[PDB]
Structures are given as structure tokens and as C-alpha cells.
Amino acid sequence: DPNLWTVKCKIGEERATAISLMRKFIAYQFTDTPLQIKSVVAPEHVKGYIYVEAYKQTHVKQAIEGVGNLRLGYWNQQMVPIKEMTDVLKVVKKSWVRLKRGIYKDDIAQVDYVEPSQNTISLKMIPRIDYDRIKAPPQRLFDAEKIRSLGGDVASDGDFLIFEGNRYSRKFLFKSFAMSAVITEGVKPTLSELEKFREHNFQPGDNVEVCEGELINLQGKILSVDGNKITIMPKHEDLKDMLEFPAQELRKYFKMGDHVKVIAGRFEGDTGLIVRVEENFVILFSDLTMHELKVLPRDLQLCSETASGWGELVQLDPQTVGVIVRLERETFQVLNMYGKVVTVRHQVTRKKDNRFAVALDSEQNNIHVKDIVKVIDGPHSGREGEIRHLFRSFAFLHCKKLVENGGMFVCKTRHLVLADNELIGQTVRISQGPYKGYIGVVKDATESTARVELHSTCQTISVDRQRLTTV
Amino acid sequence: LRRNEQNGAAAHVIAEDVKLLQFHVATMVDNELPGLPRAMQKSGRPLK
Amino acid sequence: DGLKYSLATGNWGDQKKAHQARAGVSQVLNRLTFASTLSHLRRLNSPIG
Amino acid sequence: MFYHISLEHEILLHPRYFGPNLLNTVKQKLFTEVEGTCTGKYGFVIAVTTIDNIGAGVIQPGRGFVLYPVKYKAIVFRPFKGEVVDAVVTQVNKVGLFTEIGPMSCFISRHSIPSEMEFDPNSNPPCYKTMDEDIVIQQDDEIRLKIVGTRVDKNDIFAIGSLMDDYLGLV
DNA sequence: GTACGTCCGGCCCGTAAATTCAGATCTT
RNA sequence: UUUUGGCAUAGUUGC
DNA sequence: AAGATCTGAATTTACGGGCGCAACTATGCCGGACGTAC
DSSP states (O other): OOEEEEEEOOTTOHHHHHHHHHHHHHHTTTSSSOOOOOEEEOOSSOOSEEEEEESOHHHHHHHHTTOGGGGGGTSOOEEOOGGGTTSSSOOOOOOEEEEOSSTTTTOEEEEEEEOTTSSEEEEEEOOOOOOSSSOOOOOOOOOHHHHHHHOSSEEEETTEEEETTTEEEEOOEEEEEEGGGEEOSSOOOOHHHHHHOOOOOOOTTOEEEEOSSTTOSOOEEOOOOOSSSOOOOOEETTOOSOOOOOTTTEEOOOOSSSEEEEOSSTTTTOEEEEEEEOSSOEEEEESSOOOEEEEOGGGEEOOOOOOOOOOOEEEEETTEEEEEEEEOSSEEEEEETTSOEEEEEOOOEEOOOOTTOOEEOTTSOEEOTTOEEEEOSSTTTTOEEEEEEEOSSOEEEEOSSOOGGGGOEEEOGGGEEEOOOTTTTOEEEEOSSTTTTOEEEEEEEOSSEEEEEESSSSOEEEEEGGGEEEO | OHHHHHHTOOHHHHHHHHHHHHHHHHHHHOSOOTTSOOOBOSSSOBOO | OHHHHHHHHOOBSOSTTGGGOBOSSSOOOOOSSHHHHHHHHTOOOOOOO | OEEEEEEEEEEEEOGGGOSTTHHHHHHHHHHHHHTTEEETTTEEEEEEEEEEEEOOOEEOTTTOOEEEEEEEEEEEEOOOSSOEEEEEEEEEOSSEEEEEETTEEEEEETTTSOTTEEEOTTSSSOOEEESSOSOEEOSSOEEEEEEEEEEEETTEEEEEEEOOSTTOEEO
């Protein structure tokens, strides 16, 4: 039987090469220079090269002669070994789609109306445009007022709108796109995309028990992980031999009073300790707060890292500074000196903190930052906190026991108790001293003396300002 | 190469990908390999 | 661009073939004295080879 | 628990402190340093009973500082797990009880308190009172609590006490 | 309808190992 | 209110 | 006696090092595709 030989081809032009070779064969099949090759293969997903079926390499070389697209495989060709010729032909494989071409590439598209014509479908999209303001971009909501104000290619029909290359929108882009230009299989969007429009998680080191089978109630530490049927290798108590368990047979059991973290859900990101393990309701206390958190056994993992649980000085405005008390995705929760917690945007300014600032307490004792001070008057009388930032007449106090605002509050300082030169770059004239008569330019100046670059001599000299007279 | 694994593509293409990966790693450690090209940045300059 | 490159750099041969290109053939003309310029213009080079 | 053990510490002496009273200065500086501190591996250190041997003062050859090794017999309290320990309740709160065991501050959590005890928010002195009134938990009372576990943070040990087991609490 | 402009795809030397020839301990 | 920066090729030159 | 094979001992290619520092000037990625504007 003949053999397949690899020939390097121009990328993106393999099917055209196959068509051209077929035409070449048919054109010369009756002439005195026949193509002795048998077939040409240009697979669908194999990009860069094609395959030629022949008994000889010389036949391949004499058959591809005159084809420029294969010139990079002309001098040398590589045979496909025998055992592997079955793999060249081996092939594998109100909804949501994702566009293939254009600026909306790989963007989620809610199939609004499917057209039975089998040419295009109507898709709901979030516009990635600059509203004809930068061009002469991330996903953001469609603003019809902005595109009406800026003008340009814009046609308005209330909530409906046509604009910028016949892009159609309503209230959100609503545009027809080719079905072959989108993917209908393997999108699987997330909850965030739902708003816009089982699972196994075992890790090494975690403790798991056995809920069923002849090996029941054996608790061991996870070694390896795989997808569905894990065939786990758990290090049980008082057993040197390693046994096998799938994911379904196991459960994330944890003994009382061990480090616990939450992988997902409402309680994700919080660390702490479990107190009593019931059949499935596992109750824990957080490291931050002493609130009861009840979790499923599967939503628990054994990690020994300390909780994260930040506190920067930011300028709410030039008349009032602010201290960040919580970091959020698009905002900062900031605590000012008034004691009012506010929610502000990311784009406040960073003020230069004065770590050497001195403040006076209620008893005329000097206090500084990182000083544990008791509050003896004001709204927060009775509490004790560590000074973190200072003002003319205010001081911010941190307290780990106080769960509000990460422990940050503020009190007035008096209700606490401790527990260039103008002459620079100016043409001057030395009117007195040994250097009299010389014109120069002032380099550096002080209260007493000033350096002068001497115009004439290759030297700079400092002299008293009383000896200088400006031109 | 990982893509060819997790889809389960052909094996000869995996072997050629392994060949080129081996070449790239060796050139990264040592850009002097007899009978093989020197690594270039698409500007005809040998890479350190 | 090839003539301009070769005379600008003194590498002789193709730009992509700078590995095998004889170098230093074209030099910046020396301007310190008239004698230096004249001696540079009448200079011969022996390659190692 | 309390142990009188020999420990190794290192002291950088500044050249100003040379002359007579050098070794006395090293003694005083050891006392200023080790005392009033807790460590994770060896717990609290209360006081140095004595100094066993002052090592040879090696001069660091870029600095002028002199490194002195010191062996010293000191008393250390190491809170261990699974021990009944005597304790004095120092603070009583809604969320839990704070007790002192020597230098150590033990926190008996609300769940760790037995369910036969309930906080008394109707009393001006807050307290955990039993349903049948056989023991009252207030500040400054002699109790015997079981250490559920020692927990170290910033090289300072706080443990959890429990009274679930018999023969615990006020006696 | 055409093209252009600009954003995405491609001499030594010593070693040192590989190549070549008579004991040797067999088989006859 | 106190900055900072290309690099790695070739040539030439000085002792 | 013979005949091996057969195992220690003369001859060919291949890396791979190749003076100190210091100073100066001198040069240094693009081609198809998709869209805008005219």
C-alpha cells in the first residue's frame, strides 16, 4: 500500500492547495507528465502542512513541482510511519453563544430570537464601544443619551437605536449574526452573566472519612486528586497500607477544633474553628467574629494559613481626610473624622501620612502613632485603642475586639489619655569680596550663602548673599 | 501539547510537539546545540 | 535600504546573514586633523581568515 | 506547665558598655530582654533563676558589637493540651469567659461552656448561672478547667478552656 | 469601488570515544 | 513636597 | 589441529579555551486583514 508524506504548506491555504493539486492532476492526467501520487489530504484542524499519498518520495517531489505554496516542503519530505496512518483521518468532537469575529470575539450573547431561515440569529450583546469619542474597550451598559449627544452615525427610535455600522440596540445590543459565526456548544456561562442577561473539590492534606462500604469510618489524609473516580490514596489512622476510594464514597469530614476554611457559598473567604460536627450541619466560629457559621461538610477544607481579615489614609476632599475601613470591588468604605462611614469611588487621593506627628491627649501628655490610648470622653468613652493616624484635632483608633469597621473608629485628640529659593537660576554679580567683578548664575541658595556657577572660570563657588547683586 | 492531551488528538503530532518542546527547553538552558539552529527573536540575533 | 544598511553598519553580506558578514569594512571617517582624514581614506585592512 | 530549664540566648553588646561592669551589664540586659516575653515553642518565660555560663564574647568583624552566648536557667510556663489546670476567671462576658493561669489568658467559648449554664444579662455583675443554681461563674473564683487546645499568635499563647468534663468548674 | 493605514499572525590538545588484532579458553 | 534607567553587537582609540 | 569468535590495543573527528582594564562614537522588525473614510 502507498504511504503518506508530510509536505509543509502555506498556513491557512491548505484546502486551496488540495483543490489546486486536484485540478493539476485532472489537467495532466492524459499528458506525458502524469502525477503518480494517489491522494492529497488537508485535514480540517491540521494547519500548516498537508499529506501526499505515494509509494516514493521522488513521486511526491515531482508531483508538487510548480506549486509555490509547498515550496518550503519541496527539498525534503517526511514520511508518516506505518502504525499511525489511521490517526490522520481520525476526527473528534434562549440559549447562549459567543461570537467568533469582530470586536465582540468570545463575548457572551443571549440568543434572543432564532430565525428558522438557518442563516442568522438575533443575539443580545453588551456593547464594547467608545461611543465615537476616542476612535477617529471593556463591556459597559449601552448609553443612548451619550451617543445621541456625541452625534455621528446615530438613529434613535426611543429605546431602539441604530448606530456605527448598522449596530442595532434596544434599551443592550440586539443584532443579527451568522450562526456559523457563533458557537452553540460549550459556553456554560456563570451567575454574573445570568445577572447581565455536582462538583468535587478534594485537595492534598485534607482529612476525609468513608461513609459507606466495607471500609467505613476510616479517616485519612488526602494524597492525590483526579477528576471523577479519584481512586484516592488516603493515609488512615493506624494503617501503613494505602487503600482506594472514589469521590462519591468519601466525604470531607473534620475533627472538632481544627483549622477550617470555606471554599464556596455565602461564607467563602472566612477561616475559623468547628465546634461540633453533626450529621451534616458543621458549626464554626470565625477567626474575625464570634458568630455561628453553619456549613455543609463538603464546603470545608483543611488549610492552616492565618486569616487575612488595608487601613490606608485617603483624601475624601481637601477639607476632610478619610481612613479606608473596607475594600470593595468598585468602591471603598471609608471612615472620616466625623465618625461617619461613607462609600466612595476608587478615583479619593492618597495623602502623605505624618508618622512623626505629635498630638496632645486630655491630660497634656504627648502621644504618637501606635500608642494604646483609652477613651475617657465622647461617644466612644470606655473603649481603648491603638492610634493609627493623626490630624490637627483627631485621632483614629484600632481595636481587634471591636468588630465594627475592622476595629477602626475616631476620637478627638483632646478626649483621650495615654495608657526653593527665589535667587535660584538668576544671573548675579559679585559686588564684594575677592571675587569682585564676576557675572554668574545661582546654582544653589540658602539663607546665608549661595552657590554660583561662575560664567568665566571653570568653577562654581559659594559666596554670601550680601556679596551678590542681581542684574 | 496539553491541548492535544485533554482533547485526545493524534499521537504523531504530539511527538513532534514534544520534539519542538525539547528543542526550546534545551536552547533556553544552552543556546549551543550541534546540528541545530541558534534561537532567534525573529530578528536574526542569537538569544542569550 | 541594503546599501544604506551595509554602509551604515559596515556589515557586508545580507542583513539576515550578519553572522557570516565581514564587519568593519565601512568606518566613520576620522576628523581630528587633515592628516588623520587622509590616512583613514588611504587605509588597507588585512582580515584574519 | 512550669519547668525550670536551661536555655540559650545571644546578646549583642555595644562597645560603650565595655570596661568594668561588663558581665554585670550582660546579666542585666539578659534580664531586660528575656523577661516579659512569650514564645511559641517554649511558652512564657517568667524569670531567670540564674545564669549557668556566659560564653566567650566574639567580636563581629564589621561592627564592633560583641556577640555573647548565655546559658541560663529560667522558669517557663508551657500551656499543654489535655490537662486539667487551676484557673481564676478574670473577665465574664456574653461571648465567653476569660481566665488567668499564671501569665496565660484562657478563653472558654460559649459553646464550650456547658449548656446547663446560661449568661445572666439581668444581673448588674454579668455571670453564667446554672439552671439549678449549684455553681455561679463570676470573676475571681477558683476553677479547674480542661485545656481544649493551645493556640499561638504573635508568639503569645491563648488556650481554650472547657468545663464539659466532670470534676471541673467551681469546687 | 479602490486603496491605504494600521492591528494581529508568524590553531591547539587533551580527552575521548569509536575502530581493529592476537591470548584464551572454549568448542570441535 | 528631592529625582534616577535602555540594553548588547560592531568599530575605533589610550596605557 | 583448526577455526573461530572475540576482547584488549593502534588510529580518526569533536568540543573548546583564546590579556587587563578604561574611554569615545555608532546602529537597532514586518505583512495580511479588517475596517473607515472618502
